[PDB]
Amino acid sequence: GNFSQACYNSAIQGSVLTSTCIRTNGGYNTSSYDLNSVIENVDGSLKWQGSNFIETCRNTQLAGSSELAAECKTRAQQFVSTKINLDDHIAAIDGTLKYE
Amino acid sequence: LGNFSQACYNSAIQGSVLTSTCIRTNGGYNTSSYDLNSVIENVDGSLKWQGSNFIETCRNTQLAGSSELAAECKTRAQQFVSTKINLDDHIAAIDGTLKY
Numbered sequence: 366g367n368f369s370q371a372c373y374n375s376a377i378q379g380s381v382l383t384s385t386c387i388r389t390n391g392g393y394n395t396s397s398y399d400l401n402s403v404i405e406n407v408d409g410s411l412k413w414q415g416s417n418f419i420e421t422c423r424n425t426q427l428a429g430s431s432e433l434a435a436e437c438k439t440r441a442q443q444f445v446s447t448k449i450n451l452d453d454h455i456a457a458i459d460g461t462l463k464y465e
Numbered sequence: 466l467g468n469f470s471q472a473c474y475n476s477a478i479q480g481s482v483l484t485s486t487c488i489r490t491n492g493g494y495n496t497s498s499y500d501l502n503s504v505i506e507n508v509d510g511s512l513k514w515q516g517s518n519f520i521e522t523c524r525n526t527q528l529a530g531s532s533e534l535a536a537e538c539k540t541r542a543q544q545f546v547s548t549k550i551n552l553d554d555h556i557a558a559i560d561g562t563l564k565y
């Protein structure tokens with residue numbers, strides 16, 4: 366992961382991370398990644414190893430340079446605040462965001 | 466700058482998914498899909514960017530023209546109204562793949 370070490374100007378909109386990432390040989394590339402493919406809402410907590418969190422979470426934002434923050438529903442249908450460190454698994458490879 | 470439709474053909478919408486066949490940077494074609502539920506919200510019956518999960522409260526999605534998502538979305542008063550959003554605002558063709 367550790368995309369924040371290779372990328373700047375990051376943003377979250379919905380479930381999409383956008384960032385400007387350095388290419389292997391010099392310049393930069395504007396990249397995006399749909400985190401809904403790799404993050405699950407498990408009883409109100411954002412977790413890796415699943416998908417589809419955006420269906421039951423709201424108010425997604427980037428906190429700091431690499432944390433996704435949101436408000437997600439528990440199984441009992443109550444919203445709680447939750448965060449996950451995207452640097453755990455999101456990398457930049459030759460300027461493109463990828464899940465590792 | 467979005468504008469995928471300038472490089473893409475045979476686009477279709479099914480549920481929240483856009484699929485299109487786009488010309489690659491150096492030639493040939495690639496087909497890819499994009500889950501618009503990641504980045505479009507239903508705000509009181511109107512589709513808007515800067516949110517997510519419109520599909521939960523919208524139905525009858527289709528492609529209008531070459532780049533417009535048309536749908537019927539529920540207002541706060543719980544009635545379906547027609548709405549459209551131009552996917553060229555934010556969806557681009559990047560070397561033949563749809564990206565935000």
Ligand SMILES: OC[C@H]1O[C@H](O[C@H]2[C@@H](O)[C@H](O)[C@@H](CO)O[C@@H]2O)[C@@H](O)[C@@H](O)[C@@H]1O
Nearest residue numbers: 405406407408417418420421438439440
């Ligand atoms: O329904 C979509 C939802 O399914 C899964 O989440 C379950 C649970 O962990 C959630 O707390 C509640 C919230 O209503 O929904 C499900 O029971 C996950 O796959 C989740 O990512 C997804 O949004």
Ligand SMILES: OC[C@H]1O[C@H](O[C@H]2[C@@H](O)[C@H](O)[C@@H](CO)O[C@@H]2O)[C@@H](O)[C@@H](O)[C@@H]1O
Nearest residue numbers: 506507508509518519521522539540541
């Ligand atoms: O419930 C899912 C729904 O939540 C949000 O939409 C709200 C509002 O704008 C809609 O008009 C009504 C329709 O019932 O629902 C909510 O109150 C948005 O996140 C929307 O994308 C989503 O489908």
